[PDB]
Design an enzyme around this catalytic site. Sequence first.
Site, PDB file in Angstrom:
ATOM      1  N   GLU A   1     -42.121  24.834   6.357  1.00 34.59           N
ATOM      2  CA  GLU A   1     -42.591  26.104   5.759  1.00 34.59           C
ATOM      3  C   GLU A   1     -41.471  26.906   5.106  1.00 34.59           C
ATOM      4  OE1 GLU A   1     -43.538  25.040   9.003  1.00 34.59           O
ATOM      5  OE2 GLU A   1     -45.710  24.660   8.383  1.00 34.59           O
TER       6      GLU A   1
ATOM      7  N   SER B   1     -32.571  23.295   2.862  1.00 37.68           N
ATOM      8  CA  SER B   1     -31.942  22.513   3.944  1.00 37.68           C
ATOM      9  C   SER B   1     -30.499  22.949   4.191  1.00 37.68           C
ATOM     10  CB  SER B   1     -32.018  21.002   3.699  1.00 37.68           C
ATOM     11  OG  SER B   1     -33.310  20.518   3.773  1.00 37.68           O
TER      12      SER B   1
HETATM   13  B1  LIG Z   1     -34.152  20.250   2.567  1.00 39.43           B
HETATM   14  O1  LIG Z   1     -34.438  21.527   1.906  1.00 39.43           O
HETATM   15  O2  LIG Z   1     -33.372  19.489   1.574  1.00 39.43           O
HETATM   16  C1  LIG Z   1     -33.070  18.117   1.946  1.00 39.43           C
HETATM   17  C2  LIG Z   1     -32.280  17.481   0.828  1.00 39.43           C
HETATM   18  C3  LIG Z   1     -30.931  18.142   0.629  1.00 39.43           C
HETATM   19  O3  LIG Z   1     -30.184  18.288   1.629  1.00 39.43           O
HETATM   20  O4  LIG Z   1     -30.572  18.489  -0.524  1.00 39.43           O
HETATM   21  C4  LIG Z   1     -34.319  17.317   2.261  1.00 39.43           C
HETATM   22  C5  LIG Z   1     -35.115  17.964   3.366  1.00 39.43           C
HETATM   23  C6  LIG Z   1     -35.450  19.404   3.011  1.00 39.43           C
HETATM   24  N1  LIG Z   1     -36.438  19.417   1.944  1.00 39.43           N
HETATM   25  C7  LIG Z   1     -37.651  18.876   2.000  1.00 39.43           C
HETATM   26  O5  LIG Z   1     -38.209  18.499   3.045  1.00 39.43           O
HETATM   27  C8  LIG Z   1     -38.272  18.625   0.645  1.00 39.43           C
HETATM   28  C9  LIG Z   1     -37.478  17.584  -0.109  1.00 39.43           C
HETATM   29  C10 LIG Z   1     -36.818  17.728  -1.336  1.00 39.43           C
HETATM   30  C11 LIG Z   1     -36.290  16.480  -1.791  1.00 39.43           C
HETATM   31  C12 LIG Z   1     -36.375  15.512  -0.870  1.00 39.43           C
HETATM   32  S1  LIG Z   1     -37.309  15.987   0.454  1.00 39.43           S
END
Ligand SMILES: *[B@@]1([O])O[C]([C]C([O])=O)[C][C][C]1[N]C(=O)[C]C1=[C][C]=[C]S1
Length: 265
Positions: A143, A45
């Site tokens: 993905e 993220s």
């Molecule tokens: B992202 O890679 O990371 C987000 C959390 C952060 O900013 O540290 C959450 C959304 C995205 N990741 C995911 O969708 C999988 C997740 C991992 C933990 C909470 S959701």
Amino acid sequence: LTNLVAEPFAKLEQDFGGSIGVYAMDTGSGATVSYRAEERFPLCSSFKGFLAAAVLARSQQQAGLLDTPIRYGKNALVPWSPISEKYLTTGMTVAELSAAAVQYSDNAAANLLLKELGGPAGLTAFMRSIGDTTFRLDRWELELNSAIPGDARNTSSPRAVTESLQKLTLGSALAAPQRQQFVDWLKGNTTGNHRIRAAVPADWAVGDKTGTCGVYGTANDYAVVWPTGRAPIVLAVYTRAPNKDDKHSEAVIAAAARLALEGLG
Ligand SMILES: *[B@@]1([O])O[C]([C]C([O])=O)[C][C][C]1[N]C(=O)[C]C1=[C][C]=[C]S1
């Protein structure tokens, strides 16, 4: 001779069971701290910070882009969209989607903003345009999170992240009104209290963007830090680990950030 600066980072990654990558710049002195700084780590993220910056750049020449309402439907939602799930009938402006993506890591908001740029390729092209040759993004949420060891897709390096962050927050890659909005979004992040923010004295100001792939011990944070009485520091901390079920650690990110801030001249 043995790199004595590096030894506590090597011990930290060994205790964690994986690899840690750190780069930190003191923009006052030009001093740096570097540990696996040019290795690739999954963005997760953390790409969403650079996404918001790319949208801000577009907004300079597209009058009222940031003010434009985006009316989306439930087909736009994906898991971890806690802000976006509230505006199905009212919409969100481009600015509001950007704040959600930066400050809550909202996945649906990130994918809506990627659409505005021409997809992951469009964000990669923006990063090339500011002089970042390392950043690679070729997938949408969810993905891009697979984080499989040895996959260079959807990765960057701590050094490239830090260099790009400095250009966008402190340098000239954005016009000042856009630079300032990026800074304000990073300063208002809600997701980073246990990462770089936990490493700094409470009276220092921080703007950061996190990422969590979760699999393969993969998580990260990057930040601009305004220390008491000092020029800004820019730093990035990324982790990964060899097994799919290896757990990421916020405490290891904070610990690496502390060593960087201590070592940095
Ligand atoms: B992202 O890679 O990371 C987000 C959390 C952060 O900013 O540290 C959450 C959304 C995205 N990741 C995911 O969708 C999988 C997740 C991992 C933990 C909470 S959701």
